[PDB]
Design a protein around this ligand. Structure first.
Ligand code: HEM
Ligand SMILES: O=C1N[C@@H](Cc2ccc(O)cc2)C(=O)N[C@H]1Cc1ccc(O)cc1
Ligand SMILES: [C-]#N
Length: 394
């Protein structure tokens, strides 16, 4: 006898398990056990993943309810699971979105300058270099300090909360609350700091004193800073890191993009499609009985939307494992989700990766792994799949 299939399948972000395609073909919605011991429905086909994400009766907010089956333990206050809903209800969605656009004046130039400086420092120190800790993550951290309007020198300490904040744990994490409370206190101080007049926090600081927003709590304003820093930095840094691995292992694509950088956006879009950076399915709690494929999901049950299930589905993306730059449906992947909770940072995340890759290909055209790929150490029990170090030479 065997136990119920357990999720997640593998923390490795450099290859998709063969089990995904078998599940998708045989049982594209099927019962699994999460790290907490709860049962859940794992959805792995494009059609069913999109169905769940487009039906608000599969609720993100309700995953935080006491007594619900859990994918993992909360690392934020339960109300923050509904963060974007709270932002929208406060009338702040448009202002937040405008602050985090990659098109802000001078932003793209700042990111290129930062990428080029990071790379120059690695070249000066000499191979091997660690492209995660000394390139992708610092680039993400610098980008988000600039977007938020906060001092660059405050970035590293905020970043160091993230190895705990984005854990995927069976049990509550005491360090997560320590860091959360401290980071909230930091953002609350930023809102009171007269030097902070630009970026997202500069705009929230002004809206906070605007009578049209007098209802909104200081709690929400500080929470926006902590959450957009954390989600943005973890996702952009982790995506760029694993995209760099995908690129390094494809020297002909690396060369094609180096020779024709105008194809970088189409390349990044395919790297997004094939990306394994999300370590768990996206969770939703059913608020009604809802038929999904062959399964009547029952009110109160947990559903997990496996992004690589959808994104490697051959019925939607023929030859799904291949990077094809001329697909008819190129942004139709689920790397940024779909529906009510579609990523508000999608444009910033695309541009971060495009600029990072453009800079790396110009400065390090001969970039290659400096260790055999199996030697990468994949972080476990975390909400992203990332190598602890990414050693390269050039
Ligand atoms: C390559 C980079 C990124 C990727 C792959 C990514 C991926 C995702 C995905 C898949 C979701 C949907 C979550 C769900 O439906 O449960 C999401 C939502 C979200 N993302 Fe990102 N994201 C990226 C960058 C960013 C950035 C740069 C920011 C902010 C600065 C950000 C902030 C958020 C927030 C706040 C949500 C919740 C939206 C809501 O609940 O309506 N993300 N992201
Ligand atoms: O739970 C949330 N928490 C924050 C994201 C977040 C999670 C942890 C943390 O320490 C900071 C931010 C949110 O904005 N909405 C929700 C949903 C979410 C989760 C992860 C993620 O990457 C994006 C969204
Ligand atoms: C987005 N995290």
């Amino acid at each position: 006898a065997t136990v119920l299939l357990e999720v997640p399948f593998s923390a490795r972000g450099d290859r998709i398990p063969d089990a995904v395609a078998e599940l998708r073909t045989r049982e594209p919605i099927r019962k699994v056990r999460t790290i907490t011991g709860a049962e859940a429905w794992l959805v792995s086909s494009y059609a069913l993943c999109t169905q769940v994400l487009e039906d608000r009766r599969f609720s993100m907010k309700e995953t935080a309810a006491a007594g619900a089956p859990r994918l993992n333990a909360l690392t934020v206050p339960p109300e923050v699971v509904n963060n974007m809903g709270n932002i929208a209800d406060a009338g702040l969605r448009k202002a937040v979105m405008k602050a985090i656009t990659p098109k802000a004046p001078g932003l793209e130039q700042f990111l290129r300058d930062t990428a080029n400086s990071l790379l120059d420092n690695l070249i000066t120190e000499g191979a091997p270099a660690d492209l995660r800790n000394d390139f992708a993550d610092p680039l993400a951290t610098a980008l988000h300090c600039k977007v938020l309007g906060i001092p660059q020198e405050d970035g590293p300490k905020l970043f160091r909360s993230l190895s705990i904040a984005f854990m995927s744990s069976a049990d509550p994490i005491p360090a997560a609350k320590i860091n959360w409370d401290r980071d909230i206190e930091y953002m609350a101080g930023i809102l009171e700091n007269p030097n902070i007049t630009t970026g997202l926090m500069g705009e929230l600081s002004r809206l906070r004193k605007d009578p049209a927003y007098s209802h909104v709590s200081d709690e929400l304003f500080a929470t926006i800073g902590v959450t957009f820093f954390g989600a943005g930095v973890i996702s952009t840094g982790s995506f760029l890191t694993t995209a760099l691995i995908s690129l390094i292992q494809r020297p002909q694509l690396r060369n094609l993009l180096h020779e024709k950088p105008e194809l970088i956006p189409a390349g990044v879009e395919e790297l997004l499609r094939i990306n394994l950076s999300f370590a768990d399915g996206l969770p939703r709690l059913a608020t009604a009985d809802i038929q999904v494929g062959d399964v009547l999901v029952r009110k109160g049950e947990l559903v997990l939307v496996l992004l690589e299930g959808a994104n490697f589905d051959p019925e939607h993306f023929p030859n799904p494992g291949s990077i094809e730059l001329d697909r008819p449906n190129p942004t139709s992947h689920l790397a940024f989700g779909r529906g009510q909770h579609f990523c508000p940072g999608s444009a910033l995340g695309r541009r971060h990766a495009q600029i990072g890759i453009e800079a790396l290909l110009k400065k390090m055209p001969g970039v290659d792994l400096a260790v055999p790929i199996d030697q990468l150490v994949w972080r476990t029990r975390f909400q992203r799949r990332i190598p602890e170090r990414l050693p390269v030479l050039w």
